[model samples]
Every structure is written in C-alpha cells, then in structure tokens.
Target: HMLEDPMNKALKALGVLTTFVMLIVLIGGALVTKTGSGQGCGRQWPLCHGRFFPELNPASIIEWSHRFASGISIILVLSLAFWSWRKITPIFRETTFLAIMSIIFLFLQALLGALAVVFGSNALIMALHFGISLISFASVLILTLLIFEADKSVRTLVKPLQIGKKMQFHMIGILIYSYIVVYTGAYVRHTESSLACPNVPLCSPLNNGLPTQFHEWVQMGHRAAALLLFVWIIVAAVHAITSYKDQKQIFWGWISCLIFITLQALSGIMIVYSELALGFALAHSFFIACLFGVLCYFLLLIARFRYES
Candidate 1:
C-alpha cells in the first residue's frame, strides 16, 4: 500500500539512468572509432567471431563491451519511453511524439551499427550512424526533461513569450546547419582526413594556401564548415541576448550555445596542433553533441506552443 502512490519514483529513476547510459553509448561509439577497434570483433554482429566469451584483447574488449553496453541501453531506453507514455500527463502532447522518435531512432541506430559490423558500410553510412545516435540521445534527454518538468506548469516556464520570425528562422536554420556541420566533422574521421590539413586554420598555409589532395580537401572542407558554424552561432547568440531578454530560458540557451561552440572551435584547432590526438577529437564531439542537444531542447520548447507575433 505504501508503494502504490500517485508518483512513480521508479520511472523517474529509469529516465535519468537511461539518459546517462545513452551518453555512454554515444561515447562508446566514439571510443571504438578512436581506438581503431571498429574491426576488433572480426566482422561479427552480436558476438566476437561467433563466440560469447572467446580469447579477448584490449581492442576486442572495448568493442565487445560497447556492444554489450549498447544492448542493455536498448532495453532501458525502450522501457523508459513506454513507461513515460503510460504515466505522462495530458498537457504533454509532445511527450508521445518524442517517445516514438526515441524508439525509432534507437532501433535505427542499433540496426545501422549491426549493419556496419556485418555487411561493411561506407564512410558516409558510418557517419550517418553517429548522427542518428545523436538524434536518439537528444530525444531521450529532452523527454526526460519533459517528464521531470511535468510536475510544473509549462506556461509559467515561458509566459508572455513570443518567438519572432527571424528568431524562428535562426533556430531552425542553425539546428539543421549544425547537423550538416557535425556530419562534415564525422566524415573527416570516417574518411581518414583528420590530419590532412597539417596546419591550424588552413592547409599548408606556410607553403601552399590551398588543399592539394583529396584528403586535404576533406579536412579543409570540414574546417570551412566549422568556421561558418562558429560565426553563425555567434550571430544567433547576439540576437538571443538582444531580442529575448524577457525569456530567460531562451536567452540562457543561446548563451550556452555560444560557449559550447567556442569550445568546439578551440578543440577544432587543437586537433591540428596535436596531430589528431584522441582526446581533442573526443572533446570536439562532446561539445558539438552538447550544442546540438541544447538547440534541440529549445526547438522542443518553441515547438509546443509558440507566439509567432
């Protein structure tokens, strides 16, 4: 009788834990790429060479552990989504849509991983795999926030607030643009062009001012896309500060967006100086993921009920 209360403590705990587990899933994928262990499992889908517990090694251990952890994450995330659907309030309409997206993308991400492992995928397909994982992770994160925020009044969270057309354009534009920028960065890794530029801010700036090879183009193209994003985010942040002062949530979100993008740009340069150091590479991914999630959350907020005027 004591446990049969109006509140669901278990579901809340599951939501938070599942969110953390999903982060591990994202980073674990990054680690697999970083350690050059994508092939450690010897082209096995769910098992290492058709064996559950065979002779293990560092690379194989990392790869197999990621797969195993991801398997657990699948169960946790789906459970969280289903439980939330059964428990969330009527005011939270987006909850159902987000929950559906969360499950769909999780399955998509997992299927892509298995496909990559079994049939072998191109660099583009592999990069899309990571992007899909980002969407899934962000969905779970925002859904968790919605679940936790349900006890409060959404109107109070953003009252007398209106997102102007320009701001709306920036929000949607930047979110889409950021995905493309992220894909370029991932493509840089998948195509093995991380160190092609061999210089910060430019390719062979001291000798030649332009990329001379295919790999160099890949590296330089990513840098150009990154630079554009850095500048674009700055513009968006300024608009938030000037235009959305009444909406603290919106203002702070863009502010954090700037900080994360700044960190992202700095890490971008460090990758060149460090000559493709694994730490910088991972840090780069971390900042971008954070920025993307923040942007997605803001989108979720405005999307629910917005004032266009």
Candidate 2:
C-alpha cells in the first residue's frame, strides 16, 4: 500500500519542486544584493513603488524579480510543509519540526528584507538577511530529502549509516562552524569588503600580508574563516575516507562536502581576481548554499540514526 500510494508520490514531487524554487529564491536574493538593487522598488513592501508594476530599469528588474520569485517560494514552501505534515508526521517525528522551521525562517527572511527596504538597514542587519534565507533553504532541502527517504524506491540511494562518537562530534561541530563561516561571508558582502584586501590568501602582500584598515579586516576575516573551513572539511573528509569506507553515505558525503567547499574557495578567489564579478560572486553564494544543504542533510541523518538506535 505504501509503495503504491499516489499521495506519497505527489508529496515527493511537491517537495522537490519546493526545494528547487527555494534555491532559486536564495540565489535571486544574492543577485539582488550583488547588483545593489535592494532599494530598486523604492521603499515598497509587496508592490513596486506603490504599484504592481513600475518603470523598467536594471535595478527594478532585478529586485522585482527577486520579490516575485520569493513570493512564489513562500507559497510552494508552505504547501510543502502542510502536505508533508499531513502525510509524514506519523512516520517521521521531525517532519513537524522541519515544517515549522521552514515557515518561521522564511517569514523572518521576508520580514528582514522588507524592513531593509522600507527603513534601510546597517551592514550587520543586512548580513543577517542572507543567513536567514539560508536557513529557510536548508529546511526546505531537508524536507525534500526526508520525502525521498520515505519512499521505498529511493531509500536504497542513502542507506542507514552508523558512525562513531568521534565522527558524530565532527559532523555536529562542522555544521555549527559552517554557519559562522557563512555569517562572515555575508558580512563581507554586506560591508562591501569583497575586494578590500585585493589579494588571495593574504590581505596585502606589500604590507607584510596584513590588513591595515577596517574594510580590509572584514575581508581578511572572512577569508581566514573560509580558509579554516576548507582545511576542516579536508580533515573531516580524510577521516571519513579512512574510518567510514564501508559507510558509503558518510564516505561520499564528506567527499562531496570537500568538493563543494573547494569550489567555494576557488570561486571566492575568483571574486577577488575578477574584482567581484557578478558571476563569481553569485557562484560563491551558490556553493555555500549547496554546502550548507549538505551539512543539514548530514544532521538529519545523524538524528535519524540516533532515533533508530
């Protein structure tokens, strides 16, 4: 009966659709920030300058598109949450919690964005906007994965994994640390410090590789946090390769984490060399979004393992 249930199939499709839309929303928000279109709508909340449509311009186009996409995303996410709660709550205890998180963070994301537009905001407050959107994206992604996990046909792709306490510690620690790295990265973007240092792996080569100003420090700070993350992921991946070879999920999962973080670091470097080219900056955001999703998925797996064991 479970295998043939149409409602379950519909839920899975909805979950996937919602997740993709959420990702688009995340990236689109980054696009708006990168293009300096935050106020393109001119102090509008749900309308463009007091109207549904406004005069066409680059900034308005970008900002309005982001708003429209976000509007659709909220609808899809809410539908997914409601559907998953009704369908999977009996079988998965975390469904309700994830659903709540998806809604709460999404609303918070929207609220912050609107406030930033209406009242204007500082770099610190604006930095939180990206992090809030990230939480919503991760929640929707996890929900989609949970839906797939509930399906017998897809369950084989990710088998149950057993990891030692040490591995568990690494997973938990890295996930939390990744958020700090994410916040710092957002701080760099919001503070307009992306190209402050103007060099890779160092703030200033001429100044003995040190930052001499506030903006430079902000840029260097994010770089330092990112460098540490890159190294930490390597160590974690090495641990997985050496200890969890039999656990394909852990093994390949960490490898993929390493790959994404490496790409993230590379894109970050390109952002500097290219002087924060829009493409590379967005790629930097995209990679971190992906890496965050993967980390959240690991947390879900860990929780499931604990519950079952």
lDDT of all predictions, in order shown?
0.78, 0.81
> TM-scores of all models?
0.86, 0.89
- Highest TM-score model number: 2
lDDT of 1 by residue, 1-309 (tens): 234565577777888888877776776665564222344342224245454575667657767776677889879988888888877847577889889999999999878776776544377777787788889889998888877776555444423357777887888899999999888887887787988877777798655668878889989999899889888988988999998988898899899999999999998899889886657766887888899988898787668647333
lDDT of 2 by residue, 74-181 (tens): 889889999998877776788999999999998998888777765443788778877888999999998887778766544743456786888898888899998999
Error of 1 at 39 (Å): 3.7
- Among these predicted structures, which one has the highest lDDT? 2
Tell me the spans in candidate 2 whose CA falls farther than 4 Å from its real position. 1-7, 34-64, 118-120
* Model 1 alpha-carbon drift over 4 Å, by segment: 1-7, 34-65, 118-121, 153-160, 205-207, 307-309
